Amino acid sequence: TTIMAVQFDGGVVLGADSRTTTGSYIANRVTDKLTPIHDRIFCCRSGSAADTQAVADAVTYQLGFHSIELNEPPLVHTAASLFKEMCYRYREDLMAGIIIAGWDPQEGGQVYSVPMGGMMVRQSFAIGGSGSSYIYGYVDATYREGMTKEECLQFTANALALAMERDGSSGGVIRLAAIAESGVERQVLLGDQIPKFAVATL
Amino acid sequence: YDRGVNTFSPEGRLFQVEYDIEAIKLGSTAIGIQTSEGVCLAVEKRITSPLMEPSSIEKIVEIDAHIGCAMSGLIADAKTLIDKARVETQNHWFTYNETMTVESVTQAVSNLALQFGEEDADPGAMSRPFGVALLFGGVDEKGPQLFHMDPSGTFVQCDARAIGSASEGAQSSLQELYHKSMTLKEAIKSSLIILKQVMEEKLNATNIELATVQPGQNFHMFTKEELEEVIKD
Amino acid sequence: SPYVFNGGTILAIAGEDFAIVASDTRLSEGFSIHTRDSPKCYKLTDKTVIGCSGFHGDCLTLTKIIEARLKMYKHSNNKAMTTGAIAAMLSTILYSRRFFPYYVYNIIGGLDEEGKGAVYSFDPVGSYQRDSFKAGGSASAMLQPLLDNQVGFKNMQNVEHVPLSLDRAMRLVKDVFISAAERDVYTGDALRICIVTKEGIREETVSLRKD
Amino acid sequence: GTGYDLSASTFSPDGRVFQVEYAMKAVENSSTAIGIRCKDGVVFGVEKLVLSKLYEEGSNKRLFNVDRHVGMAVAGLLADARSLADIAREEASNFRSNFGYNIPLKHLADRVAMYVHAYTLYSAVRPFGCSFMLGSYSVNDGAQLYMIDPSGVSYGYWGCAIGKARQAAKTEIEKLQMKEMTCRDIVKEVAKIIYIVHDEVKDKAFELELSWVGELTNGRHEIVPKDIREEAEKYAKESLK
Amino acid sequence: AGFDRHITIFSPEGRLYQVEYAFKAINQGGLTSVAVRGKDCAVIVTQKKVPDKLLDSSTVTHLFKITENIGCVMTGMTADSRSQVQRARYEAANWKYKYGYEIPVDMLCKRIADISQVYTQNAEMRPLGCCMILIGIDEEQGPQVYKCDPAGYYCGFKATAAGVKQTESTSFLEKKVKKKFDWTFEQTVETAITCLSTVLSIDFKPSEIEVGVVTVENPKFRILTEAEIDAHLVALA
Amino acid sequence: SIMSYNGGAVMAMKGKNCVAIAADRRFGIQAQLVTTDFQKIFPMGDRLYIGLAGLATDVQTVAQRLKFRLNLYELKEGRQIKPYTLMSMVANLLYEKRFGPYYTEPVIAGLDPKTFKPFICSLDLIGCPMVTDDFVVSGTCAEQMYGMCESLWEPNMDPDHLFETISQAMLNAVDRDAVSGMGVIVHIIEKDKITTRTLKARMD
Amino acid sequence: GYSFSLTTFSPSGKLVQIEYALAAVAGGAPSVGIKAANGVVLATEKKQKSILYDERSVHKVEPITKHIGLVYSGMGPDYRVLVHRARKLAQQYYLVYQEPIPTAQLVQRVASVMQEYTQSGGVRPFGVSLLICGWNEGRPYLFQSDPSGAYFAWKATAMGKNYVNGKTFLEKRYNEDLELEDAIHTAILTLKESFEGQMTEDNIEVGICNEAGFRRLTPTEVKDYLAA
Amino acid sequence: TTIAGVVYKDGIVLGADTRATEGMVVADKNCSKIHFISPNIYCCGAGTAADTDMTTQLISSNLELHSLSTGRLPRVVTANRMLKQMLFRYRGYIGAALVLGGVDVTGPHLYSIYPHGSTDKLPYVTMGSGSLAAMAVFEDKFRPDMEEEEAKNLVSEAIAAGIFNDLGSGSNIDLCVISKNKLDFLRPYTVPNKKGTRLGRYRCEKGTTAVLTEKITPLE
Amino acid sequence: NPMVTGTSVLGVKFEGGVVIAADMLGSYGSLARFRNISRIMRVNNSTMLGASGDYADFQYLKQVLGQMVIDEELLGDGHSYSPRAIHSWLTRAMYSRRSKMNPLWNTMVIGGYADGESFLGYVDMLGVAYEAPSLATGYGAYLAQPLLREVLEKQPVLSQTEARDLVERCMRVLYYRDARSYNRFQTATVTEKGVEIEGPLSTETNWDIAHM
């Protein structure tokens, strides 16, 4: 697994891979790791799939029920705190490693991380999964303040690709989603669309 | 009824307790007095037929070697607090390795009087109060003591008390025949003559029960022959 | 693990009209030292005193329980608590946690109801007994023999049976604690003494070896 | 009515829960506790009568700090109102513990009204006898004022007059401009109102309580300083005659 | 008899006098409402009585958004209407969570009435006084109107009215369906508004009425702000 | 294991209009005989029988509970029970104790009291019935039975040939297991009569 | 919660609430049920009288299983409870025995519920009596259940507003030799005997139970049947 | 042990094997796996063979209840949700791998469920011991928008490749087709292997087995 | 099993006040994952706290303490909490939770300034509690406490600047000889006025020894 999330001025960008594994055999090669929670809020699953799916469903239910009363679009901190509590009350039975991203009218695009412990931190960008260790150095040497949309898109694509070559538990298709005020836009990359780097030969 | 149990009247007084205290005056008469060297307790037995050997009629019991008690009113509801008294005394001797005073015993026993309610009240609890008047007695760290009880949790120390049906005549005739330096003999003689005065029968030598507690000896309940020497006068 | 070894020794002595409770004032854990000021002696009444050693977190929450129970007894019975009653209560308090017990060695000292001296020794499960001298703690093994010799006159021949005094016992415990510091590591950095007699309580503090 | 008024679980022939009218009849015997909201905050003007002057100045307080940003002014029984204050405090603490931001006001009103209305159906309880008002101010939203009756109704107002003088006092708030003037030049209007409405023969004396919230207190609900209460009282005493 | 009028039990004739009494609790508020269904649209109209100029107008409203594609309007004993609404909301969300797809109207009305029935059997409680009208759009039957009751009996309708002027309004609406015609958007609102204009003789104003619509092109509950109510009121002018 | 603490074996076969069920006879503790008249086959109504194998405690308990339920069944609604319902009842009874189960492996054999055609079933520790048309076995010496039956059982057989083949299989099988044997019993069910027989075996 | 019975014995030993619930049911909708040689038929009436009242919205002859159905004659809301409870008792039966539950057991289990509401705390009896049909073991069955918990195995019965006149008229127009069509005709005739107005293909609903299963009749076939 | 399911132009095809083994001894040679969930939904199930039967029966009962209450044909999303939740409630102590599939008002739908509560919505899936060879056949010879008589052959080949190559599966082959106006449930579709002919007999005489006792009971 | 942890914390008391220091790192095992988080808080105007160990339990305690203080600052009675009460509450919480075998992997350091008197506490996962003029958790107990002790044994009256500089020095040494540290540490103070926090700081460093 490998998930990445980036923040720009008026919105955010997400990125994920399309592989699932149960050992050395591939049970699926197209799975979708981008789960919407509201009209303008998303999530990114990692670790066990059952626990992630359950947690995300319950959070979606609670957030819809809480928004239908106040008569106001929700915030991202709310969903992040709900996730925090749900994953902290059961930290001895769960393995989730989740990320949250979205948009709201008070503050602009927002990103948060929630590892297995039950913490909650916001950051200019975030990454997670097993194949992230292999790119902790690439996002550091390339990030810069003042990035536009397309820049974040191609940045996420390149990082995902570089993580999907050396790791055996990740690969396949690259799914992307761009969030802003006007609306959402999804995208999928495969084959000759994915970047390529020449292999070294003596 | 249509008035509940945990209710107040337009005088500030509960109803069921005011009604149960109206029963004590339907019981037998009991007397208890204190001196500088011992406490005496006495009670009357109202037998009904030449049968029913009065040896079984027991109204003066032993809470412990240094503590006794006497009851009046409903003798049935009385044998529920005595076991609690013994239990507490032994639990204290077990935890602290010493003897329980009289005040502590009476307080623990009276804490259980106003626990009652038609609602949940922790089911297995009481639906009404006890109709009984209790008179304790014994020696402790500070000389001989004596107490009194009522069915409302309002105990009070005293030195010469008398309960039962005719509790007035045995008090108006007890205010003047007491002084702070009386002995045991004259104490018992006064108690017995006033009992004679208030008794309904001819005061046989077995129509009454008696007991004494002084520092040297422990709780000692008199026999039938000892109750003869004293009645000769 | 739910336990820790903090070190600490305790000593107590009785007499005809007084009692003495001495202890160290050091708190360690492992190969390092936490602090050099943490005494063990504790005053409960004007005529009784206690001493505790072992696991700190267990020796810090029992004192509060005893204080509360003393207040409640005083409120219910209308009198203070003697020494034997204190010991009989502590036995049950310890035996309550039998399958999840404390790890503290207690020693009580004070005056008997007559006016004499009394010391009671305990064990972490709740077995106590009255004695004339005891040295529960980390250095008990070093002190008990010397006390046996110099207060019971054992293995001695033609030796009188003179009684003990206050100054004598004070000097004796001081020299003992001075001696036991050069061979034990969990002992040193201070010394505290609490004397209880027919006119109340006195406290004294003494300097010792650092290491 | 024979026995249609003995329980909260009984509709009378015309359709009426009499036990709630009988409760609200209690607030018609208490002192007036008006409050308003102009542009940047809320302002309450509770009045506490003087009885057995042996008391201190500040007993029988009728202005609680329910939370860091909302304030309450009650009218009726004080015990039930204190209980409801505890209820609101617990609600606002749980909301923050679960979500992570200061509770708004609409939700607080609705929740507390549900709690109050839970008692208007069964026979094992007694309807409350207090009718209070909540006030708050925020930067995202603006000034918010509300009100609750013992039945469980929550409506948003610009001015309320809970108390025995429910009438003859609301009128005195109409002539005022309860949306334009700032939160500093209304204390005088509220004070002169509660002063001229008071009867001097049926009651011996009273004392005046106040509160404040808005941009001046940075959303925090705090008492009104005394240095301005002095001039407020002067204005009232000079305006009465 | 004896305790037949104080709790939910049977009289010698089989009636539940408590529910009959509760039916009259809808007429206390003094309000009314109507709701009609057309070819591809459902519409609701209600009154709005605000006597005090000191009261915030944008907080008093009997219309509520149970959930997207569904809408409601209530009548009588406002204190309990919000409770019924909260229950509806919770039921709808729990259904969408349990069964994966949205709950229709008939199901929701049936559930609410199932709940409102046990109050007519148990004695420790009393029945709520309120009438709930609901509107929605299903992809199989089209528009759908529904109405529960305080007794638990519901039924499907094409048009109806509730509140104080119920019978006098039905007697007038019955004269219009006798001539089946095409009602797309402009033929429902006019009829629903003339019903009130004729039963009350008011010559309504664009703030004395609240309107809620849902049509096929846009199956989302709306409120018809004054900008459109003015136009629709001058249309038939 | 714990199933092999006692030993046992049972088998069931079908015929033309008849059916057969057989079992061994022995009770011992892991190496030692105690008695030779142990019961493992029980009637569940006329023209229906059930056999059990494994821990004696559990076979006793299961039989007692099953009769407790079946009697009430037949009493409420007045009619004999059919085999499929019995199979489902037993499966539910076993699955109830999915955790802390009974160590047993039943085998059911009988007819249909409406159209007298055969029926046989073989459950397991928990369930997964195996409704077959040839035969079923249950016990510790199962391989021997599966190897002897397969060769035999021509598709159609009369009562005599059926008795013969099942007896020969069971005998030549239990003579290859040490914790099972010391006797054999056989039951044959037809439309209007039932036959019960014992055999001459090695008591060693 | 209240814990005490509201139904008690009078000096004459009669439980009164039951008589009152029965008087209630006797003022509801008329309904009829017939058992012929092939199977069973159930018919009712739509007491409502109005024009708008979308009719393809609610029914009174809803089913239970593929071969069982119900109809009521009292008050509505207390019928859906019993529907929902029987629809679960049958599933319990099937889950235990993997065989559809017959009728003579469903009626028992449903009366066991309609009874315990006569000596339980805080509640009152139901106000609805049911007529139920079924087909099991090559045999049709028809039953009635009353609010007291007593089930009657009947033959061509009628309950509702004029159950007496319906019974007197049906006692002389039924025999255990007819087919189903004669039963349809007699059911409609009995319903019309006590009608007030003009019959039509919308005021009534019908259900049939035969060798296949339960089935309600569409508003078209009842129209053809309406012609004689 | 060799489940498989596929989606085609106008419906869904589904197949499995017919063998069961208690250890390493063939206990049965004709066992049914394609279970009925609703008149338009069928669920094939591997696993512990009881945890998968009870679950299916329960879900079918609840779905029948929902259908009777609502008044229209059920869907697949509801069954998926029910199974997901009931399996997650047990932390994996219920081995109930399945390939649930069916058709509803919308297009066809194919899901795969695992004992923990994970699901997928693939167009073709397999399961059981022997799933790898079948998945290989699929990956090689699969196409989109296929017809009926092609998908049937595809599934049959995929099953046979898992029969002849795994020690835990081999017998007659089943099948099932689900369209908007058809529910072909073919059992058996084809028989690849059979028993060999006998070359002799054993002389099953009469009266060659000893006996010690006898009893007779006449009936009516 | 703690996943994201924090390293040592420092505290020393000068004349009329106290000072605390803590780095910024949520290390996951041997990885420097999060590098701009704060492990110091501010309970009220006269009390501040610091934690080591797991970071989630720290957040839980932070939330609970904040809500407690808020519930206190509502009534209005002239009373308030003092560092002693916070210390006792923490000790009792830790003990009660450990007695159920579900501890909080954290190590707490408390400062404060009451009326004329300072405070400096220590709390552990097991309920071990004591006070002192100086202390440190983790490796800070081997590389930092010795220096502080040696400095106090000759001058037990310290000024603000002296404490600040000594703290910086011990932090430098920790950064040198520790493997789970970082050059971004906050330094908080509490005077008679109130509590104050200094932003992200960095220490001076020398590596000339590498030329030998």
Swiss-Prot record, chain A:
GO terms for cellular component: cytosol; nucleus; proteasome core complex; proteasome core complex, beta-subunit complex. Transmembrane segments: none annotated. The modification Phosphothreonine is found at T35. The keyword Cell inner membrane does not apply. GO terms for biological process: proteasome-mediated ubiquitin-dependent protein catabolic process. Signal peptide: none annotated. The active site is at T1 (nucleophile). Keywords: Acetylation, Cytoplasm, Hydrolase, Nucleus, Phosphoprotein, Protease, Proteasome, Threonine protease, Zymogen. It is found in: Cytoplasm; Nucleus. It comes from the Eukaryota. Belongs to the peptidase T1B family. The 26S proteasome consists of a 20S proteasome core and two 19S regulatory subunits. The 20S proteasome core is a barrel-shaped complex made of 28 subunits that are arranged in four stacked rings. The two outer rings are each formed by seven alpha subunits, and the two inner rings are formed by seven beta subunits. The proteolytic activity is exerted by three beta-subunits PSMB5, PSMB6 and PSMB7. This is Proteasome subunit beta type-6.
Swiss-Prot record, chain C:
The modification Phosphotyrosine is found at Y120. Its main location: cytoplasm. Glycans are attached at S28, S179. Pfam families: Proteasome. It comes from the Eukaryota. SUPFAM superfamilies: N-terminal nucleophile aminohydrolases (Ntn hydrolases). It is found in: Cytoplasm; Nucleus. The modification Phosphoserine is found at S32, S38, S132. The modification N6-acetyllysine is found at K174. Keywords: Acetylation, Cytoplasm, Glycoprotein, Nucleus, Phosphoprotein, Proteasome. GO terms for biological process: proteolysis involved in protein catabolic process. The keyword Plastid does not apply. One of its GO terms (cellular component) is proteasome core complex, beta-subunit complex. Non-catalytic component of the 20S core proteasome complex involved in the proteolytic degradation of most intracellular proteins. This complex plays numerous essential roles within the cell by associating with different regulatory particles. Associated with two 19S regulatory particles, forms the 26S proteasome and thus participates in the ATP-dependent degradation of ubiquitinated proteins. Belongs to the peptidase T1B family. The 26S proteasome consists of a 20S proteasome core and two 19S regulatory subunits. The 20S proteasome core is a barrel-shaped complex made of 28 subunits that are arranged in four stacked rings. The two outer rings are each formed by seven alpha subunits, and the two inner rings are formed by seven beta subunits. The proteolytic activity is exerted by three beta-subunits PSMB5, PSMB6 and PSMB7. Interacts with SERPINB2. Interacts with RFPL4A. This is Proteasome subunit beta type-1. It comes from Bos taurus (Bovine). The gene is PSMB1.
Swiss-Prot record, chain G:
SUPFAM superfamilies: N-terminal nucleophile aminohydrolases (Ntn hydrolases). It is found in: Cytoplasm; Nucleus. It comes from the Eukaryota. PROSITE patterns: PROTEASOME_ALPHA_1, PROTEASOME_ALPHA_2. Phosphorylated on tyrosine residues; which may be important for nuclear import. Its main location: cytoplasm. Component of the 20S core proteasome complex involved in the proteolytic degradation of most intracellular proteins. This complex plays numerous essential roles within the cell by associating with different regulatory particles. Associated with two 19S regulatory particles, forms the 26S proteasome and thus participates in the ATP-dependent degradation of ubiquitinated proteins. This is Proteasome subunit alpha type-2. It comes from Bos taurus (Bovine).
From Swiss-Prot, chain H:
Its main location: cytoplasm. GO terms for biological process: proteolysis involved in protein catabolic process. The keyword Protease applies. One of its GO terms (molecular function) is threonine-type endopeptidase activity. One of its GO terms (cellular component) is proteasome core complex. The active site is at T1 (nucleophile). It is an enzyme of class 3 (hydrolase). The keyword Ribonucleoprotein does not apply. It is found in: Cytoplasm; Nucleus. Its EC number is 3.4.25.1. Keywords: Cytoplasm, Hydrolase, Nucleus, Protease, Proteasome, Threonine protease, Zymogen. It catalyses: Cleavage of peptide bonds with very broad specificity. It comes from the Eukaryota. Component of the 20S core proteasome complex involved in the proteolytic degradation of most intracellular proteins. This complex plays numerous essential roles within the cell by associating with different regulatory particles. Associated with two 19S regulatory particles, forms the 26S proteasome and thus participates in the ATP-dependent degradation of ubiquitinated proteins. The 26S proteasome consists of a 20S proteasome core and two 19S regulatory subunits. The 20S proteasome core is a barrel-shaped complex made of 28 subunits that are arranged in four stacked rings. The two outer rings are each formed by seven alpha subunits, and the two inner rings are formed by seven beta subunits. The proteolytic activity is exerted by three beta-subunits PSMB5, PSMB6 and PSMB7. Belongs to the peptidase T1B family. This is Proteasome subunit beta type-7. It comes from Bos taurus. The lineage of its organism: Eukaryota, Metazoa, Chordata, Craniata, Vertebrata. The gene is PSMB7.
